[PDB]
């Protein structure tokens, strides 16, 4: 009898082979309202197990591997480094004799090209076009080493190390974009490499940068067999809607179009046409 919160997919936890990976037990401060220290004091124990991929048997994790490879430390699970066959779902569970809450997270170890290619679904950090200086930060780096050790961070665009770019300045853990232009679209990689106890590790994150529509051009919706054509200037967290009314609600055919700067164009066919963005709700009638 557990509270089975299931599988936390708000990881982005695919990970390259031969690299470290720490995972915090997702329970704490998320599923549960408390941290590790409190729960320990509350007489809870934290336990770990997994199911391998192409398997249904919940086995124990092995903590007695060569070089103390997979390690546990409080609410963190440590792989140093990950191997291919580590891929599967890991469960942390907190239990009393009267209490039980568990969740699991996916770990997908993945292989790398010499130029950063992989089946990895890259994450997308959109940048505002022509918008002064904007910065991207090398993701998932905190926890892997103390402030006592200064690593090397190398930035790449494509297969190429970023050195002497026109509007791009690597500033350590931060990559700076000066007045972005659509020329700035692509995959960017950070390779952070550090020493741990007389071994050197490497941490690799790659992400897609897409330059999109400025806030200073964001605007309520613009309206143009009866076509209701509406133009939606790009706004970041916006639900673009379009509907005909007659008074309340013959076929139809929606058609989303996008542009280079992600400005939406919903065309929808067939007496009044409406549109709603995060900046407005308007309507225009028909002849």
């Amino acid at each position: 009898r557990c509270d089975d919160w299931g599988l936390d997919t708000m990881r982005q936890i695919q990970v390259f082979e031969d690299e470290p990976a720490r995972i915090k037990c997702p329970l704490f401060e998320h599923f549960l309202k408390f941290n590790y220290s409190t729960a320990h004091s509350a007489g809870l124990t934290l336990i770990w197990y997994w199911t391998r991929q192409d398997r249904d048997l919940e086995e124990p994790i092995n903590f007695r591997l060569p070089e103390n490879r997979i390690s546990k430390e409080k609410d963190v699970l440590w792989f140093r480094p990950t191997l291919l066959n580590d891929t599967g779902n890991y469960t942390c569970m907190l239990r009393n004799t009267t209490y039980c809450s568990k969740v699991a997270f996916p770990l997908e170890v993945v292989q790398k090209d010499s130029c950063f290619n992989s089946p990895m679904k890259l994450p997308v950090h959109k940048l505002y076009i022509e918008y002064g200086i904007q910065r991207i930060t090398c993701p998932n780096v905190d926890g892997y080493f103390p402030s006592s050790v200064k690593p090397t961070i190398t930035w790449y665009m494509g297969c190429y190390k970023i050195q002497n770019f026109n509007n791009v300045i690597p500033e350590g853990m931060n990559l700076s974009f000066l007045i972005a232009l659509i020329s700035n679209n692509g995959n960017y990689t950070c390779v952070v490499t550090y020493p741990e106890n007389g071994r050197t590790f490497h941490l690799t994150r790659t992400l897609t940068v897409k330059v999109v529509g400025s806030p200073k051009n964001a605007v309520p919706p613009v309206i143009h067999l009866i076509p209701c054509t509406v133009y939606f200037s790009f706004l970041m967290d916006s639900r673009n809607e379009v509907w005909w009314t007659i008074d309340g609600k013959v076929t139809i055919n929606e058609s989303i179009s996008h542009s280079r700067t992600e400005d939406e164009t919903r065309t929808q066919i067939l007496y009044v046409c409406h549109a709603r963005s995060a900046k407005g709700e308007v309507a225009k009638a028909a002849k």
Binding site: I129, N166, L181, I182, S183, N184, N185, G186, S259
Partner: protein, 151 residues
Amino acid sequence: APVRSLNCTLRDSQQKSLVMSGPYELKALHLQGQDMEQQVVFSMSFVQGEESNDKIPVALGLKEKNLYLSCVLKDDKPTLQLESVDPKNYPKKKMEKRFVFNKIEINNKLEFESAQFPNWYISTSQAENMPVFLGGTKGGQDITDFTMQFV
């Protein structure tokens, strides 16, 4: 009028102007106000090329020098040059692929993609007094992004 031209001046994103440097060669550099007259005045002929969803096929000729910018191979590498022509014949309407560029123009920021060699662009160098060329990279060491001003 079989095609429309307009007469424009060009600069790159780091504000360098294009001047002609000894013929068959454009170079990009910063210019002082008393030498603004030294700018290559361009004629942007809006030719026919492949319909694109969002590009505009144009040919880039210099103004009464009877030269047009061109894209050809040279040691098996796409290269940008000035071909000379008979002005009674040009500005044609279906221009040969080595004349046509695809204009991408976003908030009045232009880059011209060679139609002959896709994913190649008119690049300038960050350095000064350095000749205009043709690059295989956007977003890197070379500037591929330009501004337009009219005449």
